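Dear support,

We are seeing what looks like truncated structure output for some complexes. This example has five components. We would appreciate it if you could run it in full and send us the complete token output so we can diff it against ours.
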Amino acid sequence: YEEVARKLVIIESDLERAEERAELSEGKCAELEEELKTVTNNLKSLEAQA
Amino acid sequence: YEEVARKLVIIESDLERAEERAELSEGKCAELEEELKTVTNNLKSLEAQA
Amino acid sequence: EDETTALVCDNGSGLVKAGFAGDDAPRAVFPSIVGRPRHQGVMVGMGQKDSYVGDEAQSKRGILTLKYPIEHGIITNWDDMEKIWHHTFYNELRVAPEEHPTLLTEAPLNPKANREKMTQIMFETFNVPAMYVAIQAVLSLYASGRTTGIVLDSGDGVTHNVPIYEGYALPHAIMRLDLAGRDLTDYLMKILTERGYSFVTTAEREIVRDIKEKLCYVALDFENEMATAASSSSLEKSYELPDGQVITIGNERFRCPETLFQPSFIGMESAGIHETTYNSIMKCDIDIRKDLYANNVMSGGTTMYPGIADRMQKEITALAPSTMKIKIIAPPERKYSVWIGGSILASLSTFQQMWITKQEYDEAGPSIVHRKCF
Amino acid sequence: EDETTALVCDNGSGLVKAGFAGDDAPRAVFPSIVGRPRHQGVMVGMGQKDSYVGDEAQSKRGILTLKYPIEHGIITNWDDMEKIWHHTFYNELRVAPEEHPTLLTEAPLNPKANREKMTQIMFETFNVPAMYVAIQAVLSLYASGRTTGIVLDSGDGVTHNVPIYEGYALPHAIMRLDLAGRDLTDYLMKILTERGYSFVTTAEREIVRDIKEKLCYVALDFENEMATAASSSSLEKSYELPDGQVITIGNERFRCPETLFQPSFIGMESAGIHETTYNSIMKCDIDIRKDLYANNVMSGGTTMYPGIADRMQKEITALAPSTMKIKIIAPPERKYSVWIGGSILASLSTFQQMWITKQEYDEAGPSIVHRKCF
Amino acid sequence: EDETTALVCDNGSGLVKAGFAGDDAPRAVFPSIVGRPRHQGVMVGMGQKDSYVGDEAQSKRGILTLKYPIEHGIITNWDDMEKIWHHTFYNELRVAPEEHPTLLTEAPLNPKANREKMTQIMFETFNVPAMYVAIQAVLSLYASGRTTGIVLDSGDGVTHNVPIYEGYALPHAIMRLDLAGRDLTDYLMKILTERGYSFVTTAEREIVRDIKEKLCYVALDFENEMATAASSSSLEKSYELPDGQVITIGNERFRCPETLFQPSFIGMESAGIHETTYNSIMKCDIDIRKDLYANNVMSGGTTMYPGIADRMQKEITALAPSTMKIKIIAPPERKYSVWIGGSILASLSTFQQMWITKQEYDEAGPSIVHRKCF
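Here is the complete output from our reference environment:
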């Protein structure tokens, strides 16, 4: 139980960090998506301007 | 042991998913870095053109 | 020793940030709360301890009624503030204030009585060689390393806005807006009730403060995010209470910081924080406005929410001339920017002559605060 | 017939008040209780009857365990509420709900799910042409015939406070306080135990509810009346139980309603009802406060105690500026004020277009409650 | 001598536990019974002795009718209680109460008259320098050496529940539940009758008390153990009566303690002991609940049954959030925990100023119990 539950905790601690990486990377994905949309909206405003 | 072994499989599967979400959110953030650099370079091209 | 170090304390409401001047980060940061045993205790060999101060009160929360001694940048209760400063110096920093000059921060457009009574306590409670009271927004500007900007200061106490140009300062263009972290907390516990979660007491009022410190975010468009709240997926988050109860918060999450941009939700007419920034910039001279638009500095604890900077950028750019580019500079670490600005100020060599001395106070009295300092 | 009449039901906790709109008093008023045979019956040709509803449960009390289906303005159990409404319409009023539009009252700051599920049952249980859900405090204000006031609503469910000015309403200034008739009953059976009388079960919990409905009163000063409890003469009252046991209650009598003004007795930090009224009035704009002080309206069943109005007047006058005169208008008949306010509303000609129609629900779903109505 | 020692007596119903303060175990523990010769004696040179007290009454049981003088934590008969205390001091401990301060335990939510009359007897019957009356549950908490917990106190008198946090105490969250060892005994002699064994009188009522003190246990699941009662093997136990009659008890054995978790068997609505613990913890503030779940303390004589701790753990864990871990700390020696808590309290140096003095009683009367002590 401790070997498997400790694997559950290790895998879960890696999971929390992988999930944290999913949240940090999703944070960046959303930030880059906001920047992408800001830059793409600027691109479209600048296509219209160009 | 069986509760934590099946939940170890859920937590390994949720590590694979947390990691998959790390990879998917990182992969998508990196795709967005490329999309962002593409629209930033297109914006810089259109801004330079404008 | 040379220079004697110096001490710096930020007391906006909610948090004491304190440490040595000449360091990049404060040693001690803790909640500005005085929590009193409301329930009569029945054992022998307890405490007794009339009241608990600091994060001691956070640990022993359920017994206590908690009183914030500062509301809206105003000290409500002076003995409670003295107890908080007694806790900073003796419990954390372990300093004799007689051995250090002490910098205090204080908020703009604030009653004279707070500055004058604050100095009266610093000289006649903790005997101290010298002190200074300084404006919160200018300290954050120093911390950001810029000579020019419009500083949007919002703590848990009140929101303030000070435009600065090349140093200087514009007294008429300084704006103070009664919104805060605390008013967002009172709005938030009100908007949880429609979901069935009822938080009625001071102890779990700080639990919704903790929720709002991480779960809450600002919409890059409010209506668009409220529309996508129909298909609830990512907008819900599970939160764990210390009870072991689970809370699940959807659209309710992002419409709490939305109150900064829509004070009609709180029921106040007073304009949103982006229009207050326009109100400050419009009161400034025509010439300087170009860099004030491009050098907006966010400071304080209630500018920490994810996406505030982007929302302010979109709204100020939408209202302003698109003739000029509106850069907002909002650092991470912006929470501690006032304390860092106080660290840099007391480390400045010239500033060591602009201290209010104990001697100058003893001759000329407590009223000299306004006469010497801004 | 013209206008079709209309139906009005008040369900705060504790009592269904129901009748026709267009009349000065409800036809049917009964306790909102679902009482279940806990003891297995052994005869032949009983009932069986799975459960008893209304004052039928009051008559057959000792067998039954009684469950209030509404707690704190929240319906705990939906089938039990449906059974109560089934009892109102068929047992008392003898109406087909298909032939009448139905007004329901509901409490402020209440979970969305209660309003939305309440409408879902009204359309998809008792087929009905139209309905409305309305706030309790505004209905009492209408019943009192005043356009302005701060309505202190306290039922057996929860206490609520809604300031109103010239119609309108202030959402930020609405306060809800978790105290009730029911919490005073739980306090009361706890304070009888020190005298030796122990009421442990739901059946005699309604016996202390009946005691408190007449014997209890509010002190015009608590300490003065508690001091004169040393010489017991008029403060004791003999009460007869249905058992034939006699109960003799002294100072214990008036310190039960004292809990409204001292929630430290119940162990809650949440301020007394006079400070909650100050908390509501202080959140209002400066200009209107003058008439809100002078136009306080008491409503609900747990404002019925003798001397509440005088105690609230003395405390609010003591806290407030004595610059302005604090009139409290607390009518006798204040118990039924919400139902009378619902009678007058459904009798209003203009209101007959603001009904939630069955058709509009069938197209746009149960979520439209909040969209159309307050 | 220094400190004078002190005396400690626990009188919940059923047992006097008494001895010196400053010792780990009481010297004298005996049944709280006054047994009277019901049958007129015909010899010469008997006794006569109007009544027998203590384990003398246990030895001479068959002649006597036995009267417990305490029922439900309430003294029914005062002369009988005085006789029991007269027996403790003179028959066992051999002390003059004039030479010792005396601690009494007493139960929560108990009539004022018991505390006030108990003090009146201690001063005006056994002349004594000082005394104290203390709550049973807090003493067991002290004995367990913990500062925090929810104490489940169940004696032969009544069941009580007191949550404590860091010392302190929560008056609203204190629960008292009318179940006991004695009510389990009355249930038990009722459930023996279906097997043909009929115990009709007080003397053999204490024989089923002795049966229940060892044979009875609590099921880790009731239905599972009642199902395996079809194949009777280990669930039957032979018991020897003092008559020489043999009793053989099967499923009847474990369903007697099951009544604590199912008071529908006794016919009372009042919730089982695990739901009463939830009722106490739910009335507490949100913040502290985490350690109250993990620091449940069992005390008293009717928590002695094998498997109670495991059953409470499974039920409280099943009802509660599984987010937090529910540790129950139930020591062996838990029977004497109240007396040990009284030993430690009177040995505390600070506590030696919180005694009710004889002098303070002589000036201010018997009513001062509630004024000074909890």
